[PDB]
Amino acid sequence: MDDLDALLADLE
Amino acid sequence: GPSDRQLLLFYLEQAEANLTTLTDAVDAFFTAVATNQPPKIFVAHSKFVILSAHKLVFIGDTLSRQAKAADVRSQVTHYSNLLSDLLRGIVATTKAAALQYPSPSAAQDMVDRVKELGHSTQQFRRVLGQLAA
């Protein structure tokens, strides 16, 4: 499981 | 076992609730793509899909860590890993659809990963119900 903040950050 | 069954019934209920939010986010995402919305729109909707599906990954993570039965741990860890893999796939294809916009093929790749996520999350929930029975 990945950190959600990091997944979102990569689309931001 | 008693503690596993109770844990599974509880998180089945949580999964069902989160699956509602996910279905709304996936629907909204598909609609964005079907009305040819630009990256500022479909990238936002991608993030909504990822955030809402991540709730299910987290449930899988929480369940897998606390379940006693080897087969329960195995199945839920499988789906947690699978969903996590698909979330990275959605980040990858979304970026590619934006970088190459407008590209019908890039968009269809993104749409396909999101469809696969929808299917796999429904399957995860089905399996929880089966495990809880």
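qc> The radius of gyration of chain B is 16 Å.
qc> done
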